[PDB]
Amino acid sequence: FSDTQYQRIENYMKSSEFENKQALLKRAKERYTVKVQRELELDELALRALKEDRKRFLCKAVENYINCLLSGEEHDMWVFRLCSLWLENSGVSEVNGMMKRDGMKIPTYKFLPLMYQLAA
Amino acid sequence: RPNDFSAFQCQKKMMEVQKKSFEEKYEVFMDVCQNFQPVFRYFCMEKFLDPAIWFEKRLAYTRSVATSSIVGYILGLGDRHVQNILINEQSAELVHIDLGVAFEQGKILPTPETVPFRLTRDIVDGMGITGVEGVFRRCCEKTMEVMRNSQETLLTIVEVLLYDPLFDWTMNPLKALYLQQRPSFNKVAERVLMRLQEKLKGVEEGTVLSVGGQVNLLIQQAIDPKNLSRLFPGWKAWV
Amino acid sequence: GVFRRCCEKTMEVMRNSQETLLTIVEVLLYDPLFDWTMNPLKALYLQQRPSFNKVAERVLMRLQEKLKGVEEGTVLSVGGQVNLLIQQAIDPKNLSRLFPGWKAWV
Ligand SMILES: [Mg+2]
């Protein structure tokens, strides 16, 4: 569920509607000045809130995936998702911290199917 | 409800929280909704004293709301505030006016609209004790089945319209600034057509949904308090 | 007989596990050392007779469409998709237009 929400937010940020909204704001940028500046403040606040929500969802999804992999062996195939949420978010310090603390307790053989992708 | 908050008080409370965080907006909206209860159910009560006529008018109102909601969602109708919707005093049916904003151009506004249609507390309260669980949901499902079964014709009509040279449907900064005041074209047209084609099928957020599932998703998005708290105060979410 | 039923069963299996398949293909396609895109030199070598991000995203989109019933924009069942694939594979007009090295007549 956390991954679904995170992917929804990411897809919205990658959508063409977001680009159209940003382009409309920039076109409005170039007593309209006060209103344009106010709307720029508003959309900056919205962008910061969206980024915070994305970070929270990503962290929750990563930690729950690690816990699921630690719990049992029936869902080992989901390890591909975990690395996919890590290799694409190497900049985020929380993901690296969660990996370093907990993912080193995961049995190593579960990482064998994607060993080619880690080494690269 | 003389003891509740007045409309002016609710408007003032919601306008002063615009430049704040989302949790503060949400808590202010919830507090306003706590002290502002729907009273629309009396509309049919004081105009039709005969129980049979009252039942008929209430059913007609519910069916009109369902049909208008589904059709407006399909066409991406926006700017559905209290002054743009009329109710007939004889048939108790809704009429929609001021249809300038359509095809989801309301989501490009600086304060985007995050609801498919207007399903606020007064609208649901006007439906009876059951709410949106009886006639409303079934009528919405029937209308959506009709729309899905005739998708090719709808795409054809919208394709004919969107390429009309004199139809100015795209949002521009001047219109955006005028709409919200407080006291390449080919790519856009193709994307709008793609979104409409996705709508007329079950593809929501990339997954195929049935008519019932799509109706449930639309209803739960329309009445979601977090969605309602984030809209423009002029839309009057608490009403 | 057996061929169509087995194809339908395999396609049902693929459809029921689409999320995992998208995840695996996403992991692979962004591997820096995986050179899967076509280049003019490889194209010229393959048929001799005697932005990366956009391409990867489009390939992922096409794969996601494949693992559902979306063929030519319409949703198809497993049987319908299998029928479409079979009729495309054996179509004589399709076979006549391929490279002679593929040996369509064989
Ligand atoms: Mg008006």
Curated annotation (Swiss-Prot), chain B:
Summarize the impact of K19Q: Found in a patient with familial pancreatic cancer; uncertain significance
Effect annotated for changing R41H: Found in a patient with familial pancreatic cancer; uncertain significance
What is this protein identified as? Serine-protein kinase ATM
Annotated region (Catalytic loop), positions in chain: 76-84
Domain FATC residues, every copy: 207-239
Its family remark reads: Belongs to the PI3/PI4-kinase family. ATM subfamily.
Motif Microbody targeting signal: which ranges? Answer: 229-231
Q: What does this protein do?
A: Serine/threonine protein kinase which activates checkpoint signaling upon double strand breaks (DSBs), apoptosis and genotoxic stresses such as ionizing ultraviolet A light (UVA), thereby acting as a DNA damage sensor. Recognizes the substrate consensus sequence [ST]-Q. Phosphorylates 'Ser-139' of histone variant H2AX at double strand breaks (DSBs), thereby regulating DNA damage response mechanism.
State the species of origin: Homo sapiens
